[PDB]
């Protein structure tokens, strides 16, 4: 049975409110979440991480932040559309949404703003740099099935040792987890553990995009192949996601229902803006873009999406009043026409499949990989892939980012090439006499990250035989937190500085 | 009169407008269109590289004009939601014509918040200083305050009050005064209508008409409107458009759109706390020292005063992260007292605010709530805005914009016939520098100059006066549309140091 009062959970993990609360009181809780996010440093840092182009002098080109804002507006429209559609069907009160219209919209909007919040400095390639660096260090595949005669893991405490013990199972998970950094999983870790934001359960469910655990080592079940596409949460947040599943009535591996909407807003906004920026960067003219889109659509008919959306924008751009630029006019109507077709479709799909979406078990996206709407989105991606993401300036930035994050990890390698007693001594005494380098390296790590390491390790049972395994897991999480929390420019700056090349 | 917001929340447009019935849902979709136009505008994106108080950092820990505008948007949202909730509790929502405009009402406020500072020139208050100073020395608007004077210090022949047989001197008077009162709020109206051609809804544009004084105003403003006419609100170049707007929004002369008080209140609130949070991040003073500076600057300290309920409270929560805890609850405690006060003030004065004639702010002195804000401001002035890094940036920004204007003097030091020849033939043989300088001007600005000039009657004796005005707006558009970093770059590039 569908009752959104049971999914839109306004409680918090810490210092929680309890007890009935009016519509207006519930409104205030979710607006509090809004203020927490908007004033978060993690949101402000998005204006200096890059979205496709190198982020140059005139802010003409999008950043992770301005992209998110554009995405947030698409998510707002879908939510408004779903709700409006439901009011006309008379299902509003029946679905328990009559006193939750605002929060429903707000949760979607903030989840849009908050994708990419856990993304490392150079996007897809920073993740790559992290996971590649730890794979050569941990070799999780040599921990697949029972000890290997010669384990290539660099760490004594993690080596799959002597054909015995369950720990081998914990080692199996730790090694896999640390080699599957994923921005979405880091986002949950960020809003809960690092920033200590104390969001509502509903809000955090909205950024839990995938439900596969990072330590998962096999093929995902046939029934959940889509919701488990990428890792969604880390080993370190397993207890927290457990409490979240209970609070949001999630089965294991089930998704929060508003996540499908944010996912659709991502899918829509994923590309068009990058073409507009490509025209700004003078890569091709708007005229050339129309023909690249005309060519890649192929099977052309009077009546198709192409005709109704992208051909429409091309004609409007030719002979307009409102003294607007041709390119301004083309892209404005490319954006609007795309929204007018793709938002209602996403909203309807949400409603048509609301039972499985509510249960969180619906193994599909709103813009289903089959549909004609997904074909329009594939159209934009095909052009962007062959003509924008391949541009040398973009590709070089990707090369540069990979070397920067890779090199940074080596600079902090000393902190990992240390025994437990050694690293622990560095945590208690601020100045360790015989470890001058590791000392100073330790203090560069942001205070929030060191605090989360101390807090996590202190919650462990001191005497357990798995303690050194857990400590190392948290030590690595400490470093990955520090790196992934940087901006593109900060990480570039620290790299050059710690190799001594700035003044 | 009587209060009906169906008459203020005007969803028509200036160009290619919608007319005809429109259901509640349709009107919502119109106002959601404005949202998409604004959020996707380059002019909002340029806000992430214009500075809000502190120099830009390599890790964006510090606020920019964009992050600041987002915080202001959230405060505006709350005040709007609060007014609507109070009004439903009073049973006045349908009574005031708002029951089908709840959405738009909130959205117009939210966007107006995001869109203040959109017209601000690069280095903020000081780019404004640079522009007005540079044109003051070229146009000397005070030398047209009365009868023509024998020695008109205006550098422009056609703008000197010639001899003494004209109402053309009256237009000269306005042009000279207008061009020396560049004001970001007035530039914002120009930007969203003429330059970006966003074709926003009348209500949405009325929301950013913050002040009602024309930039060409030369004397003392009336006692009944001294607050609404504090700073200039629109330029001579937009006079006719602001006339269409006043009609569409049912504004008397010098009257304000009612939702502007809400945006204005959100600005006043989130204006200062964030800068203190940043001051602590940059390790200028500790949160402990900051507490004591606030205790001391509150002077007359006592009881269960607003200090005790808001800042002393936030100090206590922080003693059990520390800086985050203090500022999280400092912002929150401040909102919880000041947003309802504004929502109350707005409803308590809704007749005058609806007529648009209320000569006060929603907060405005008197109140203990304004005393709280003044406390944040007084501490920020004595301890943050006085920091040398801030003051150096303000010095540098002033030189940059001043120098940039001097680099483009040649475009201004040209006759009409010469400048016009430069607009048609792109290559003018004998003007190599002026030619190349002219092309550096953004296409959107050049295009707005052409449209402006073409609407004029060619034969008129005032034509050369208008062209110089539009030529000057052309330069001011170009400069004010830049970001902090681009302007610094262009300065260095054109002075040749890269
Ligand atoms: Mn995205
Ligand atoms: Mn402001």
From Swiss-Prot, chain B:
Tell me which Gene Ontology terms the entry assigns under biological process.
dGTP catabolic process; nucleobase-containing small molecule interconversion; pyrimidine deoxyribonucleoside salvage
Q: Which PROSITE patterns match?
A: HD
Chain ranges of the HD domain: 65-272
Q: Which cofactor does it need?
A: Mg(2+)
Catalytic activity as recorded in UniProt: dGTP + H2O = 2'-deoxyguanosine + triphosphate + H(+)
Molecular-function GO terms, alphabetical: cobalt ion binding; dGTPase activity; GTPase activity; identical protein binding; magnesium ion binding; manganese ion binding; single-stranded DNA binding
SMART domains for the chain:
HDc
The UniProt record lists the EC number as 3.1.5.1
**What is the enzyme's main class?**
hydrolase
Ordered alphabetically, the record's keywords are: Hydrolase, Magnesium
**KW Hydrolase (keyword) present:** yes
What the entry lists under Pfam families is as follows:
HD
Q: Which family does the similarity line name? A: Belongs to the dGTPase family. Type 1 subfamily.
Its function, per the record, reads:
dGTPase preferentially hydrolyzes dGTP over the other canonical NTPs.
What assembly does the database describe for this protein?
Answer: Homotetramer.
Concerning NCBIfam families, the annotation shows:
dGTP_triPase (TIGR01353), PRK04926.1 (NF003429)
Q: Could you tell me what this protein is called?
A: Deoxyguanosinetriphosphate triphosphohydrolase
> What organism does the record attribute this protein to?
Escherichia coli (strain K12)
Q: Which gene encodes it?
A: dgt
């Amino acid at each position: 049975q569908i009752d959104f009062r049971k999914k839109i959970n306004w409680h918090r993990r810490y210092r929680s409110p309890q007890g009935v609360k009016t519509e207006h009181e519930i409104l205030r809780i979710f607006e509090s979440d809004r203020g927490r996010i908007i004033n978060s440093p993690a949101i402000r840092r998005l204006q200096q991480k890059t979205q496709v182009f190198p982020l140059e002098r005139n802010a003409a080109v999008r950043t992770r932040l301005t992209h998110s804002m554009e995405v947030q507006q698409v998510g707002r429209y879908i939510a408004k559309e779903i709700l409006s559609r439901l009011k006309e069907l008379k299902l509003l009160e029946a679905y328990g949404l009559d006193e939750l219209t605002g929060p429903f919209e707000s949760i979607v909007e903030m989840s849009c703003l908050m994708h990419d919040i856990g993304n490392p400095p150079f996007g897809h390639f920073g993740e790559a740099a992290i996971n590649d660096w730890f794979r050569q260090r941990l070799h999780p595949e040599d921990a697949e099935s029972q000890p290997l005669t010669d384990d290539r893991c660099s760490v004594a405490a993690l080596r799959l040792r002597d054909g015995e013990e369950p720990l081998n199972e914990l080692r199996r998970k730790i090694r896999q987890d640390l080699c599957h950094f994923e921005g979405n999983a880091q986002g949950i870790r960020l809003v809960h553990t690092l920033m200590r934001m104390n969001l509502t359960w509903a809000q955090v469910g909205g950024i839990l995009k995938y439900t596969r655990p990072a330590w998962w080592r096999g093929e995902t079940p046939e029934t959940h192949h889509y919701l488990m596409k990428k890792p969604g949460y880390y080993l370190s947040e397993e207890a927290y996601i457990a409490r979240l599943r209970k609070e949001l009535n999630l089965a294991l591996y089930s998704r929060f229902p508003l996540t499908w909407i944010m996912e659709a807003a991502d899918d829509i906004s994923y590309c068009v803006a990058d073409l507009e920026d490509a025209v700004e960067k003078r890569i091709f003219t708007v005229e050339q873009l129309y023909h690249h889109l005309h060519e890649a659509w192929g099977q052309h008919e009077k009546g198709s999406l192409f005709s109704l959306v992208v051909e429409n924008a091309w004609e409007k751009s030719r002979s307009n009043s409102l003294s607007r630029s041709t390119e301004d006019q083309f892209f404005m109507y490319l954006r609007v026409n795309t929204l007018n077709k793709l938002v209602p479709y996403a909203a309807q799909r949400f409603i048509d499949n609301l039972p499985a979406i509510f249960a969180g078990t619906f193994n599909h996206a709103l813009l289903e990989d089959a549909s004609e709407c997904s074909d329009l989105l594939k159209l934009y991606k095909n052009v962007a892939v062959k003509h924008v993401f391949s541009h040398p300036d973009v590709e070089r930035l990707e090369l540069q980012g990979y070397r920067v994050i890779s090199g940074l990890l080596e600079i902090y390698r000393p902190l990992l090439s240390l025994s437990l007693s050694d690293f622990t001594e560095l945590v208690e005494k601020e100045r360790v006499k015989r470890f001058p380098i590791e000392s100073r390296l330790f203090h560069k790590l942001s205070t929030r990250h060191r605090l989360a390491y101390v807090e996590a390790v202190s919650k462990l049972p001191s005497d357990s035989p798995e303690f050194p395994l857990w400590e190392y897991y948290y030590r690595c999480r400490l470093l990955q937190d520090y790196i992934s929390g940087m901006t593109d420019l900060y990480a570039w700056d620290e790299y050059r500085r710690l190799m001594a090349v700035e003044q």
